[PDB]
Design a protein around this ligand. Structure first.
Ligand SMILES: CCCCCCCCCCCCCCCCCC(=O)OC[C@H](COP(=O)([O-])OCC(O)COP(=O)([O-])OC[C@@H](COC(=O)CCCCCCCCCCCCCCCCC)OC(=O)CCCCCCCCCCCCCCCCC)OC(=O)CCCCCCCCCCCCCCCCC
Ligand SMILES: CCCCCCCCCCCCCCCCCC(=O)OC[C@H](COP(=O)([O-])OCC(O)COP(=O)([O-])OC[C@@H](COC(=O)CCCCCCCCCCCCCCCCC)OC(=O)CCCCCCCCCCCCCCCCC)OC(=O)CCCCCCCCCCCCCCCCC
Ligand SMILES: CCCCCCCCCCCCCCCCCC(=O)OC[C@H](COP(=O)([O-])OCC(O)COP(=O)([O-])OC[C@@H](COC(=O)CCCCCCCCCCCCCCCCC)OC(=O)CCCCCCCCCCCCCCCCC)OC(=O)CCCCCCCCCCCCCCCCC
Ligand SMILES: CCCCCCCCCCCCCCCCCC(=O)OC[C@H](COP(=O)(O)OCCN)OC(=O)CCCCCCCCCCCCCCCCC
Ligand SMILES: CCCCCCCCCCCCCCCCCC(=O)OC[C@H](COP(=O)(O)OCCN)OC(=O)CCCCCCCCCCCCCCCCC
Ligand SMILES: Nc1ncnc2c1ncn2[C@@H]1O[C@H](COP(=O)(O)OP(=O)(O)OP(=O)(O)O)[C@@H](O)[C@H]1O
Lengths: 140, 344, 19, 63, 50, 459, 320, 98, 53, 54
């Protein structure tokens, strides 16, 4: 239901931390299931058990990503009371990248993902704030 | 192939799309697409090797399903409205299924997995037709229904095509797959703007054809199908490196060449509708599309590779192959930007 | 002294089907 | 030649480019309105043909 | 080995045409290149431009 | 301007239709004449600038770059004449055509009215440079160098296209006269700070900043020479010009979006000059010096004061001349030893006592010698920075010290010492490569005699 | 009018041209066995034309003025240097071998261009179906490294099936001492200093491999010296052959057409020989290759296409 | 009518699911395509008979024509596949990746 | 008129002449505000038809 | 800074990222079974996106 994910913006950051947290966790889980279906269809496993393990690893990883993201965002918005501040989303993206490089044993992945996801989440907040309508209807 | 057969087959190839344009019934549209399908397979499978059989089977089996899905969309529209035309107040599911099947026909990502394979499995000609002329009727369908398409998957598919074409062509030593991933990326640029002034989609199509056809001729002149084979061109036919370079740098869109016009004006009409960050991503992955062209043109034009002892025989003998249209199409690409307002 | 042009070790990396 | 040439040529160029700006923005708002509502010549998407309807007497009255 | 030519060794010029200027091998072309450079670069540009 | 860029196009048939023996001469002489006729646009008897058409204009910032671009071509062309002398005639002529294309496109850039003209030309300049670096470089790293030099630029420039397109969709014209007289103050939002960055971090890459400069050593070190001349003389200034043009539509964001870049420029200038103090490669030493100089231009343009823009223009032209001169001086020895290692040959001034004067003058230009358009620029931007903040002179002075050091160290460990007696291949000198240094230095003296021209928009 | 589909449709077919002696016939044998003396008389008697053995210089002779070129244009190879130094580090051996395979290949192509165009028969000698013999001889000795064998066999794999085989082959046999003494009485310091195992391996290769696999498709006519003399008897045997058992029987006008088109273009003929397989014995480096190409395009008759050379004496050049 | 149109669309979807989800053989895929054709035919025919649109009744015959030509060329390709590999399986067709 | 290896010296002067002609053509194109600017706006002298051409 | 860390951060990170994405992307095997399974996944995602967005 689209309203479920639209509940992320019924109230600003710093408030309803658990709600937004496991919303973002669900979102990461969905994206991980997509990636897992693609990695299981293409380059399939030697056995159905290992295919299931692939799905579980990918899904739990992306779920952890989203969970750390939501926790960090709503915490750093509660602390240093500043909802309209993309630095909270930056710190959340960096926490996500750190969990990516922790679940996947790599410091370079950690740093690369920190920078990229942090900037992505900052831009996400900036666009949600200033009104960037990706996939817009044609107007001219 | 005897001449009667070639006449029949090439007439059918020409008439598939022509029926597709000059038809208001979607069903004769489907008929034209199926003529394009049927008549291509003989010449794909002409050399009679396992690679050709595999290419033809993959092409056939991927295009038949897309054809059936389009026919489903058409029959559902006929049930809904009692007509043979996608009006407004049709179902978005019908229209989106049509879009999905048309993307599978073109070769767009994530329906792209068959195009480079098929293209490698067939000669340089039948790659040219497959990548240029077979793209024209499936695009005509979308062009005729552009105010009915959802502006969301139309852009997600474009973005996926951009990214995946760039990343796939990054690592392909085979040229017949580089051309395929280039097709994927350019169809992405087209489909992104197709709900927004579809004249620009046809512009990018014409530019892409005018660039690819002479490139295929260049590959044909020595049957070059690999970076190492195109690298032995400073010895065989070295008067072509200038045009090959400018054509590759037009394909990977650089400003002074006319291959930057479609991307530029597409970004224009997309920023005129607040489609900003999507255009940013596209423009930033077109650079990776340019990188492997630059690698290639290093390999063939700037850092001349080792050659062989037997390549002097080619220097003894003479050639006749440049059809006099390679020149016109290579020079009308790469040098027609100042005439861009007359193109738009 | 002389301009450098490629060698076989530089060309062999463009013959692996996947690069 | 002199300064008058440069001054007044600059003025000409300025009116030209100002008018061009005006017309570009006008064209944007025009296209916007024409597409949002099909009152104008552009973005008039096709409808079914009227002349291929049969108006003759049928086999049943309540056609 | 792969049948390339070896490095051509260090050329000396002033053996041939010890009035070499820096431009070409033909002694006439060097003269009519340096005269061109000097004239067109100093005597007209750096003078009349100043 | 048309009278400057049509003859420049006619220089191409002059190459291709001439004899193999009478092609360098004709094109060189006629290039000098293009340079001569590029002085008509210094006839500015008034405050109003020179508009020749909707396409072309010329301000006191355009004109010095125009003249310098038209003037470098004969110098590039004569410096490029010892190498590729044993090259086939078609290859020569292709080199000539690339250099003339650079001339034409760069004149069109500095003369452009719109920003999109400037964009497509600023990017068209990449193709000749890449070809020159790659087909005529001597080493194998030229390929990676070309990739770096191309993709840094493109990464920076795609956002620039997006921002220009936005400005067109917002205002309607993208012309520089009209953006001057119609510039709305900005609302100070993230959506406009990203616009600032998109407009600036194409030029800041090309100048370059210290965070991003790795393309410039790899290219200078590996381009044959003439590519190095251009890449040191006007391709870096092609970013400063753009900043000076585009900053007018970004007020008041430059008051706070400039701290990081001023700071990076200053500290990284110190870092780069310290690198120049300790560097095995001469052609890299010149390059890092160019970074340490262009950083001041970055900070100066960021401050946006009259003194600052002025000194930026002065430093631009001065650095271009003296850097091309130093690259020529290093190439003069590289054409004999075929090594960029400086400590190899270290006891000259016996064999080359006249070139060793051009060396000295080139270095004194480089360090802050007062009766020189180098010190005028450096001093005026130092004064601007002191007005900005008094605590910047602490860094500028460290730079001045290190910049005396590495330049005098270059001179000493290249000229002074004991001759490397194992070098029988030190041929006496070329009248060509003496005239080169004379043509680089005589302009510096003339412009020092009259710097009223070499200032910019503000004086 | 260059030949093509238009000509074939107009009526320049091929089966109208074949009468009886429209035959690709190759005479084979060892180093000195009487091949040219026999092929010449076969061609005289039957009405064919003689196509001598393709040496280092066949492209040069059938191109331009038809002269020998300097050895760096017509290869980089010498046969003398193979006989006086067969285990060089400089890979003269396989360079020569591959150059000669390509020359035999172009020779066979010119032959088939003549046959199908005119119907006139062709006598070859030691065609591309019998060139591997010397390769196997070199490789049984240490005159080749095995990678060159893979190169040669790949090029053969790519080039051979496209062309039709000969109708009959004429392998005249001589024992090794007989040919060795014949070489001694030939008058060459270099062919004189060749071994006997080289010749015996040539003979073994011929008799084992070349004869049966060609008897599977062709009519073999093994003769000896006393039979090889008096060509008229060999001719009188050729006159009464039933030319069955081969792929020539299943050929239409359009198969002949596409073969004639593949053969009319020498670049498509030789493309698969110029592959970039980077053996040091075949690669020639960019600097040397460019020097050669420039010096070749700075020769009389070269530097442009054939008719477009005014320095030779061509004319109407501004109107072609 | 709405019931049977729903059922026919679900039948199309099943045959599409089939021809997408491959097994070893290819003939089964071609048969799934024939089943999709047949369901589309019946949908078109039933809509035409309901609406009494005898002008569109030439459409399903065209569907059958072109679908049978499709089947023909598919079966010819299958002949070639068997002549190459011998056993109809679609896993042996894995040499264009390299 | 033998062996014209020196006609090429007319290309660049030709380019200069043509460029000056084109600039002349452009400032003929832009002959608006020719005497309508608020700064000069002089009345025509007794023998004058255009002010700066 | 210049020879290791400014190379490891800005250029080499970019190179490694794009080439690793290339590897995990284009290392496909020529089996229509798997391609068509992915096509089915795309059908499912498109219909779900439609049902959700609506
Ligand atoms: C820019 C792209 C540069 C790509 C680099 C290509 C390259 O590597 O050069 C080959 C080089 C090989 O050297 P080479 O063996 O001496 O070349 C043999 C020639 O083909 C030998 O050719 P030829 O013997 O048949 O005759 C010489 C030939 C020599 O001409 C050429 O082959 C190339 C000339 C192209 C000049 C482009 C310069 C850029 C002009 C800006 C506009 O023809 C001419 O005399 C030139 C006539 C005038 C120019 C005609 C070009 C018209 C097309 C214009 C396109 C402009 C695009 C920009 O490497
Ligand atoms: C009030 C403010 C005014 C500014 C005052 C500036 C204060 C800063 C002082 C800087 C000190 C630099 C220094 O240490 O001098 C090194 C420098 C070292 O030269 P050197 O090692 O003795 O040369 C001997 C060669 O190694 C061995 O070869 P050589 O014996 O054949 O050399 C003979 C002589 C030959 O020189 C020439 O032939 C002159 C070429 C121009 C010909 C003029 C044609 C006249 C027709 C025009 C129409 O020297 C040269 O080759 C050098 C030519 C370059 C001269 C550059 C002129 C710089 C003037 C700056 C103003 O001293 C000079 O000779 C430069 C001239 C003196 C500097 C200008 C003094 C101020 C004059 C007021 C303006
Ligand atoms: C907006 C809506 C519309 C869409 C936008 C428009 C889009 C433009 C259309 C799409 C562009 C792509 C079309 C590609 C066409 C196919 C190109 C091709 O494969 O030919 C390669 C062909 C190769 O030339 P070649 O290797 O020298 O062939 C010589 C033959 O061997 C010569 O010997 P042959 O025995 O093979 O004879 C060949 C025969 C072939 O003639 C036939 O077509 C067969 C019909 C026989 C009737 C019986 O021609 C004849 O000799 C006379 C007929 C008897 O090169 C081109 O065709 C390049 C031109 C491509 C067209 C670009 C125009 C774009 C504007
Ligand atoms: C509506 C809801 C939309 C939610 C969007 C979810 C985002 C999904 C991201 C794309 C999935 C990519 C998964 C992946 O990592 O590719 C793996 C696969 C190869 O598998 P493997 O190398 O073993 O896995 C490595 C782990 N990175 O690599 C591949 O086979 C390439 C597959 C790429 C296809 C991606 C297309 C997704 C967009 C389709 C739009 C329709
Ligand atoms: C504004 C700032 C932005 C700056 C951007 C600048 C981008 C510059 C990109 C140039 C990178 C070239 C680096 C090559 C250095 C040479 C190293 C070498 O000698 O070759 C070795 C290298 C493989 O080395 P290795 O890491 O060990 O990989 C095998 C380990 N399994 O072999 C290689 O991997 C060759 C290099 C392959 C490069 C992959 C593709 C590069 C794509 C560049 C980005 C394009 C822009 C995309 C924008 C989005
Ligand atoms: N493929 C090959 N590899 C190596 N050497 C070859 C090859 N083909 C020919 N030669 C050499 O070329 C020479 C050609 O002599 P050939 O056998 O042709 O004699 P001929 O000219 O036919 O007349 P005769 O047989 O009477 O000597 C031989 O010495 C042989 O070693």
């Amino acid at each position: 239901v689209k309203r479920f994910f639209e509940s992320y913006h019924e109230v600003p950051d710093g408030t309803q931390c658990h709600r937004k947290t496991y919303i973002t966790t669900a979102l990461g889980g969905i994206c991980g299931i997509i990636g897992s279906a693609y990695s299981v269809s293409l380059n399939p496993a030697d056995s159905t058990l290992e295919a299931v393990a692939r799905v579980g690893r990918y899904t739990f990883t992306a779920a952890a990503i989203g969970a750390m993201f939501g926790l960090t965002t709503c915490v750093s918005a509660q602390v240093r009371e500043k909802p309209d501040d993309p630095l909270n989303y930056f710190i959340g993206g960096c926490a996500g990248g750190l969990t990516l490089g922790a679940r996947t044993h790599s410091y370079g992945t950690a740093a690369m993902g920190c920078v990229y996801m942090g900037t992505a989440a900052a831009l996400f907040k900036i666009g949600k704030l200033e009104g960037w309508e990706l996939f817009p209807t044609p107007k001219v | 192939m005897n001449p009667i057969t070639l006449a029949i087959i090439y007439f059918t190839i020409f008439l598939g799309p022509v029926i597709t344009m000059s038809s208001t019934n979607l069903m004769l549209m489907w008929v034209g697409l199926e003529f394009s399908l049927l008549a291509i397979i003989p010449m794909l499978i002409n050399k009679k090797n396992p690679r050709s059989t595999e290419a033809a089977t993959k092409y056939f089996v991927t295009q038949a399903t897309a054809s059936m899905i389009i026919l489903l969309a058409i029959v559902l529209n006929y049930k809904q409205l009692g007509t043979w035309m996608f009006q407004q107040q049709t179902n978005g599911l019908i229209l989106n299924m049509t879009l999905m099947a048309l993307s599978m026909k073109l070769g767009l990502a994530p329906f792209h997995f068959w195009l480079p394979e098929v293209t490698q499995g067939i000669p340089l000609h039948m790659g040219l037709i497959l990548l240029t002329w077979q793209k024209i009727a499936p695009l005509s369908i979308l062009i005729q229904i552009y105010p009915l398409l959802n502006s969301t998957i139309i852009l997600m598919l474009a973005i996926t095509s951009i990214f995946m074409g760039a990343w796939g062509g990054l690592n392909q030593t085979q040229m017949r797959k580089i051309m395929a991933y280039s097709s994927i990326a350019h169809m992405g640029w087209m489909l992104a703007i197709l709900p927004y002034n579809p004249s620009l989609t046809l512009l990018n199509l014409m530019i892409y054809i005018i660039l690819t056809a002479p490139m295929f001729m260049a590959l044909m002149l020595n049957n070059s199908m690999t970076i190492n084979s195109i690298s032995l061109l400073w010895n065989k036919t070295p008067a072509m490196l200038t045009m090959i370079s400018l054509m590759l740098l037009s394909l990977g869109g650089l400003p002074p060449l006319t291959g930057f016009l479609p991307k530029w004006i597409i970004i224009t009409e997309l920023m005129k509708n607040n489609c900003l960050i999507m255009a940013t991503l596209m423009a930033m992955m077109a650079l990776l599309n340019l990188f492997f062209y630059t690698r290639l043109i290093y390999s063939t034009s700037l850092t001349m590779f080792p050659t062989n002892n037997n390549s002097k025989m080619m220097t003894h003998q003479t050639k006749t192959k440049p059809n006099l249209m390679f020149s016109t199409l290579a020079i009308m690409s790469t040098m027609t930007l100042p005439l861009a307002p007359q193109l738009i | 002294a002389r301009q450098w042009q490629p060698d076989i070790e530089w060309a062999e990396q463009f013959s692996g089907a996947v690069m | 030649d002199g300064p008058e040439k440069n001054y007044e040529k600059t003025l000409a160029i300025l009116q030209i480019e100002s008018e061009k700006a005006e017309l570009r923005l006008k064209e944007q708002e025009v296209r916007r309105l024409m597409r949002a509502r099909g009152d104008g010549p552009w973005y008039q998407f096709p409808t079914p043909e009227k002349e291929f309807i049969d108006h003759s007497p049928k086999a049943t009255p309540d056609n | 080995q792969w049948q390339e030519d070896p490095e051509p060794e260090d050329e000396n010029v002033y053996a041939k045409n010890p009035d070499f200027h820096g431009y070409d091998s033909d002694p006439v072309v060097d003269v009519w290149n340096m005269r061109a450079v000097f004239f067109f670069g100093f005597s007209i540009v750096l003078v009349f431009g100043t | 301007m048309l009278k400057i860029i049509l003859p420049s196009l006619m220089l191409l048939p002059l190459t291709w239709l001439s004899s193999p023996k009478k092609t360098w001469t004709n094109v060189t002489s006629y290039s000098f004449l293009i340079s001569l006729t590029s002085l008509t646009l210094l006839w500015q008897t008034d405050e109003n600038y020179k508009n020749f058409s909707n396409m072309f204009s010329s301000d006191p910032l355009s004109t010095p770059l125009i003249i310098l671009t038209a003037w470098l071509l004969p110098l590039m062309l004569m410096a490029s004449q010892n190498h590729l002398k044993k090259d086939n005639n078609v290859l020569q002529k292709l080199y000539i055509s690339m250099l003339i294309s650079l001339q034409i496109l760069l004149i069109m850039t500095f003369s452009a009215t719109e920003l999109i003209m400037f964009y497509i030309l600023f990017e068209a300049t990449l193709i000749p440079t890449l070809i020159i670096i790659t087909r005529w470089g001597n080493q194998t790293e030229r390929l990676n160098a070309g990739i770096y030099f191309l993709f840094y630029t493109l990464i920076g420039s795609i956002p620039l296209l997006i921002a220009l397109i936005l400005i067109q969709n917002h205002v309607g014209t993208l012309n520089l006269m009209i953006l001057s007289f119609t510039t709305h103050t900005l609302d100070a939002s993230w959506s406009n700070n990203l616009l600032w960055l998109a407009c600036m971090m194409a030029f800041l890459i090309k100048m370059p900043l210290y965070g991003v400069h790795l393309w410039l050593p790899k290219a200078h070190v590996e381009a044959p020479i003439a590519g190095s001349m251009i890449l040191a003389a006007i391709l870096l200034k092609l970013g400063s010009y753009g900043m000076i043009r585009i900053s007018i539509i970004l007020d008041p964001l430059t008051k706070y979006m400039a701290y990081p870049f001023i700071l990076l420029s200053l500290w990284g200038m110190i870092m780069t000059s310290s690198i120049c103090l300790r560097q095995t490669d001469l052609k890299s030493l010149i390059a890092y010096s160019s970074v340490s100089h262009m950083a001041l231009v970055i900070a100066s343009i960021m401050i946006q004061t009259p003194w600052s823009f002025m000194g930026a223009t002065m430093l631009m032209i001065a650095h271009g001349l003296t850097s091309s001169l130093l690259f020529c001086l290093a190439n003069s020895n590289y054409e004999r030893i075929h090594s960029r290692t400086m400590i190899m040959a270290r006891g000259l001034q016996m064999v080359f006592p006249l070139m060793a004067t051009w060396w000295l003058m080139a270095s004194l230009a480089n360090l802050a010698l007062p009766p020189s358009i180098n010190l005028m620029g450096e001093l005026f931007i130092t004064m601007s920075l002191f007005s900005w903040s008094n605590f910047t002179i602490i860094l500028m002075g460290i730079n001045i010290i290190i910049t005396g050091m590495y330049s005098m160290y270059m001179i000493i460990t290249t000229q002074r010492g004991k001759l490397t007696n194992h070098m029988i291949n030190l041929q006496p000198s070329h009248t060509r490569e003496l005239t080169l240094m004379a043509l680089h230095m005589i302009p510096l003296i003339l412009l020092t005699t009259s710097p009223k021209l070499i200032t910019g928009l503000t004086m | 009018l260059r030949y093509g589909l238009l000509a074939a449709i107009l009526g320049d077919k091929t089966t109208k041209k074949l009468h009886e002696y429209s035959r690709v016939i190759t005479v084979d044998g060892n180093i000195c066995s009487g091949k040219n003396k026999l092929a010449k008389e076969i061609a005289q008697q039957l009405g064919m034309k003689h196509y001598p053995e393709a040496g280092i210089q066949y492209s040069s002779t059938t191109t331009g003025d038809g002269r020998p070129l300097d050895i760096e244009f017509s290869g980089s190879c010498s046969l003398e240097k193979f006989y006086d130094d067969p285990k060089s580090n400089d890979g003269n051996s396989y360079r020569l071998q591959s150059w000669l395979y390509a020359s035999r290949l172009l020779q066979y192509a010119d032959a088939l261009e003549h046959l199908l165009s005119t119907g006139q028969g062709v006598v070859l000698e030691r065609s591309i179906y019998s060139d591997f013999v010397f390769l196997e001889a070199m490789y049984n000795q240490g005159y080749i490294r095995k990678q060159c064998v893979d190169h040669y066999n790949e090029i053969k794999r790519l080039t051979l099936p496209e062309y039709l085989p000969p109708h009959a082959v004429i392998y005249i046999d001589v024992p090794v001492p007989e040919v060795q003494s014949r070489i001694q009485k030939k008058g060459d310091p270099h062919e004189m200093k060749v071994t006997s195992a080289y010749l015996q391996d040539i003979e073994n290769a011929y008799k084992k491999t070349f004869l049966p696999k060609m008897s599977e498709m062709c009519e073999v006519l093994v003769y000896d010296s006393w039979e090889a003399e008096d060509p008229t008897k060999v001719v009188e045997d050729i006159e009464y052959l039933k030319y069955n058992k081969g792929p020539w029987l299943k050929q239409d006008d359009w198969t002949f057409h596409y073969l004639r088109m593949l053969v009319q273009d020498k670049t498509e003929v030789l493309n698969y020989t110029t592959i970039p397989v980077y053996l040091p014995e075949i690669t020639i480096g960019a600097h040397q290759g460019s020097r050669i190409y420039n010096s070749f395009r700075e020769l009389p008759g070269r530097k442009y296409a054939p008719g477009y050379n005014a320095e030779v004496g061509d004319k109407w050049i501004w109107l072609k | 009518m709405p019931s049977t149109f729903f059922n026919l669309t679900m039948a199309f979807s099943l045959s599409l699911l089939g021809t997408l989800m491959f097994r070893s053989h290819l003939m089964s895929t071609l048969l799934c395509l024939e089943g999709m054709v047949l369901s589309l035919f019946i949908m078109t025919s039933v809509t035409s008979l309901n609406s009494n649109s005898m002008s569109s009744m030439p459409i399903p015959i065209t569907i059958l024509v072109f679908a049978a030509c499709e089947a023909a060329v598919g079966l010819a390709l299958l002949v070639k596949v068997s002549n190459t590999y011998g056993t109809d399986y679609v896993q042996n067709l894995n040499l264009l990746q390299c | 008129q033998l062996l014209r290896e020196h006609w090429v010296h007319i290309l660049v002067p030709a380019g200069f002449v043509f460029g000056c002609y084109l600039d002349r053509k452009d400032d003929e194109k832009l002959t608006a505000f020719r005497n309508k600017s608020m700064l000069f706006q002089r009345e025509l002298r007794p023998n004058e038809e255009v002010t700066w051409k | 800074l210049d020879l290791i860390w400014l190379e490891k951060t800005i250029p080499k990170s970019t190179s490694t990222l794009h080439t690793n994405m290339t590897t995990l992307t284009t290392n496909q095997k020529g089996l229509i079974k798997l391609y068509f399974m992915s096509f089915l996944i795309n059908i499912i995602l498109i219909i779900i996106l439609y049902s959700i967005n609506l």
